[PDB]
Ligand binder design. Structure first.
Ligand SMILES: [Ca+2]
Ligand SMILES: [Ca+2]
Ligand SMILES: [Ca+2]
Ligand SMILES: [Ca+2]
Lengths: 82, 48
């Protein structure tokens, strides 16, 4: 993950953030983008969480570090649009 | 004298260095380690 050269060479996602802990930034360095910085790094150890689409009734998903947000449309709500 | 040289007669006797044939080895002076550095000096950095 870290070394004298692991973080001195070119930043590639096919290198640093994959086979250790991927603590931080090494998922942001590759892209230079703090938008999905903490909406994807939660999916390094335990697997994805929105791939099941818990929200039904045409509701979008949002991943948080422990709980899932389900955006349901006007007049629709719920923990999973439930 | 034979030490000095003259061109037209090819005046030069073959000579061998003294220390080459007989070595007087004494080591060196190695009390300071020599360091090379990155072209920008400071190698790696983090974002702050
Ligand atoms: Ca690596
Ligand atoms: Ca990176
Ligand atoms: Ca990295
Ligand atoms: Ca870095």
């Amino acid at each position: 993950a870290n070394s004298f050269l692991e973080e001195m060479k070119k930043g590639h996602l096919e290198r640093e953030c994959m086979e250790e802990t991927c603590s931080y930034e090494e998922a942001r360095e590759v892209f230079e983008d703090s938008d999905k910085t903490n909406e994807f790094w939660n999916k390094y150890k335990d697997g994805d969480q929105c791939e099941t689409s818990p929200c039904q009734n045409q509701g979008k998903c949002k991943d948080g570090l422990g709980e899932y947000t389900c955006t349901c449309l006007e007049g629709f709500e719920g923990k999973n649009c439930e | 004298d034979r030490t000095r040289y003259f061109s037209m007669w090819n005046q030069a006797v073959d000579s061998y260095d003294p220390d080459v044939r007989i070595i007087e080895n004494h080591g060196t002076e190695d009390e300071l380690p020599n360091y090379c550095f990155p072209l920008g000096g400071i190698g790696i950095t983090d974002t702050f």
